[PDB]
Symmetry: C2
Subunit: 115 residues, 2 copies
């Protein structure tokens, strides 16, 4: 389940808790190269995020046409999740709804690329 | 501590049973399983009219959520339902967690008091 893997991965990028580290995350961390750290606060402002939002990727109005675009969206989710801080108000369910709507069609292409 | 992150991690682990995703943070949550009989679970699943692409749809159960003890039952139902529906990729966890957190978030403070 790419749903299960990606939820676990983003939540771990958010809290950085080493007791929730998993080897399954290693190939996902490599996608970080697709996003510059210095653009993160720009991506956050473009998604008009409040303190109670996770990544709201649909608000970037960037197309998802292929597996490379999925990797970028995962990378944006990871770095945003990283920089917004370990905060209880974050409505992760809304963030994952948006993410999976945008990328689920390419789950097949993603699993081929990972494995 | 985010009850959202703990509970997502906990239910996903009750769904796949993957021992590399076990965490000690789950021990106190496992004890809530006593609030739900294994024999009732298939009945709760049928009542929620769940398809293969549904996680727990707790709002369909017509059960009351008025205190922290009721939250513990809802978490326990989530766990045993997540357990019995199988490790299937089509499960729309985001919809399931939306319903769960809508139902229980107001009691997060009472929950964290009971856990700690």
């Amino acid at each position: 389940s790419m749903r299960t893997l990606l939820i676990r991965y983003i939540l771990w990028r958010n809290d950085g808790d080493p007791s929730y580290y998993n080897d399954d995350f290693k190939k996902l961390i490599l996608f970080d190269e697709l996003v510059d750290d210095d653009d993160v606060c720009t991506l956050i402002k473009n998604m008009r995020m409040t303190l109670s939002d996770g990544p709201l990727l649909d608000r970037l109005n960037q197309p998802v046409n292929n597996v490379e675009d999925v990797k970028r969206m995962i990378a944006i989710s990871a770095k945003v999740a990283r920089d917004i801080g370990r905060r209880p108000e974050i409505r992760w369910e809304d963030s994952f709804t948006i993410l999976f709507r945008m990328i689920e069609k390419y789950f097949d292409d993603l699993m081929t690329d990972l494995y």
